[PDB]
Design a protein around this ligand. Sequence first.
Ligand SMILES: c1ccc([P+](c2ccccc2)(c2ccccc2)c2ccccc2)cc1
Ligand SMILES: c1ccc([P+](c2ccccc2)(c2ccccc2)c2ccccc2)cc1
Ligand code: NA
Ligand code: NA
Ligand SMILES: [Zn+2]
Ligand SMILES: [Zn+2]
Lengths: 275, 275
Amino acid sequence: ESYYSIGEVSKLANVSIKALRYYDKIDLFKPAYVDPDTSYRYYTDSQLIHLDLIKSLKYIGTPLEEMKKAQDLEMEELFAFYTEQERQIREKLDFLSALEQTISLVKKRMKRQMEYPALGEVFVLDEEEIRIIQTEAEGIGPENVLNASYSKLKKFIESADGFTNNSYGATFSFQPYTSIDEMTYRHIFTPVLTNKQISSITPDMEITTIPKGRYACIAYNFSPEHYFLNLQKLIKYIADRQLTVVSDVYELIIPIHYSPKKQEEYRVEMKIRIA
Amino acid sequence: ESYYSIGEVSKLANVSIKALRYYDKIDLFKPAYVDPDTSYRYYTDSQLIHLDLIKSLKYIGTPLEEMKKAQDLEMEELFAFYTEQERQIREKLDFLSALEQTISLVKKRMKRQMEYPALGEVFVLDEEEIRIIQTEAEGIGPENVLNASYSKLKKFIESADGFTNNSYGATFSFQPYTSIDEMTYRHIFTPVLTNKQISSITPDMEITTIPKGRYACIAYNFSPEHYFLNLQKLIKYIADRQLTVVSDVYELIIPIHYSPKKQEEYRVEMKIRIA
DNA sequence: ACCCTCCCCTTAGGGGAGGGT
DNA sequence: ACCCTCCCCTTAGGGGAGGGT
Ligand SMILES: c1ccc([P+](c2ccccc2)(c2ccccc2)c2ccccc2)cc1
Ligand SMILES: c1ccc([P+](c2ccccc2)(c2ccccc2)c2ccccc2)cc1
Ligand code: NA
Ligand code: NA
Ligand SMILES: [Zn+2]
Ligand SMILES: [Zn+2]
């Protein structure tokens, strides 16, 4: 013969009144009784127990309506349910955990960029390999190149990485170019970070890599008048130290801000490998 | 000199029109321009890139408004941001992962119950230990005992386990009782599952355990007329096989359904340990 | 002091409809 | 065919106010 004022309840079970009042209307936890004069809600000591499964359920993060159907069931039943909630919990787990590493990649990459000590001049080094899938730019030249021109490769990388292209790129041959118009892009790629089996690749793509080798590269921020010279310094550089090239030029631009509020920029980075 | 119909966009970047239209009003991704006749939205090929950070951001699961402030920043800045997003991701991780094991406990327990082969009769066995905190029931008897009578211990276990009391319990001495009224509860406890340092325990509690020992226990579903006899069979059992008891009786009830829709039941389980 | 109720806020869009080229 | 807009749905409550014992 003991009843509890709603407050009392909110006190006993740790509950937001608004919360239980909500449950009453939600029609989950209803008062044992309602004084139809004061519309006050008064619960029964027995009731409390109900507030467990909801409470527990809530903790596990199960949407209320499911909680409804959940209450009716008996042990061995609810048990299975619990297991469901388990594969579940255990799934966001590995989903989430995945990105955890993915990010790391993005950062280890992000950083790597800002660390370019010789912003402006040619730098030589030992680089690590770069899994990347690319296609064959059908006549795309440094002039024409778009974004649209990327899309496919884009869609793909998102499907597999979840994370989109950060730094866009393209290869072109190696020549003692006279002018820009002189040059025209070969393949255009995108770096790939999700180690998992990249599947469903329509054969128009090639999944490949930028072999961990000797690199002659240089970086900056784009400027037409710029871009040029830098390729120049580049060509010259090699020519001078008479080294032997081994690939095409990996030009690889990355936007620097993403603000729309203002005139975009991108750190560019052309590179060749050598022996 | 290339523009894209909103659709085109939705096609190029993988986007729900409603989604970008939302971004336009959200005032994140705005059309490059709006034909003030047809109010159509037309974006610039350049724009696309913006759709990266949002897209990426979205993936990581960062609320739009934060995405707003996120766009303005530059590399080394956004980088930190990224790291934030990291501790973050890496936090739901271990939070979540925690329960993952917690559940397992609950289940390994849940199951354990349904497996009681001798529902009705006394069973003897080798049990594992039970970390549990309890208090000293101030005169609570099998008659009086509430829920309210629990609250404190309750609040506590939730703070530490997140998960609430599933199976409620209490100890009482061991005697050749005549009647129920004859008996009166000693401590009442609650089992504890979160292995972590149970802190802030107000000294009115005792954190303890149900020593992995020999047990004489029996189970059922509550029924007043029942409860009694079963304690009886119990007492008798020992007495008969003249064993030597070593603790008090661990009576430990658990509700069987949680349906409010109907008259509650609970599997009870009284037990003593012995040598 | 407690309670009750009504209302208006929070996110990220989706569906659906009418209407217009 | 595409687009545009308006509207009304989704969750779990919170705050806040007025009013009543
Ligand atoms: C003695 C015991 C219980 C009630 P009451 C009730 C409580 C508070 C205010 C008005 C009425 C009640 C409330 C909640 C649970 C059990 C009992 C009560 C009286 C008449 C009809 C229904 C309930 C009355 C007298
Ligand atoms: C040639 C090139 C672009 C435009 P328009 C435009 C497009 C579709 C329908 C009406 C107008 C445009 C739209 C989006 C991006 C760039 C250009 C255009 C015409 C007048 C004023 C503003 C925009 C017109 C002629
Ligand atoms: Na209509
Ligand atoms: Na008012
Ligand atoms: Zn080729
Ligand atoms: Zn004691």
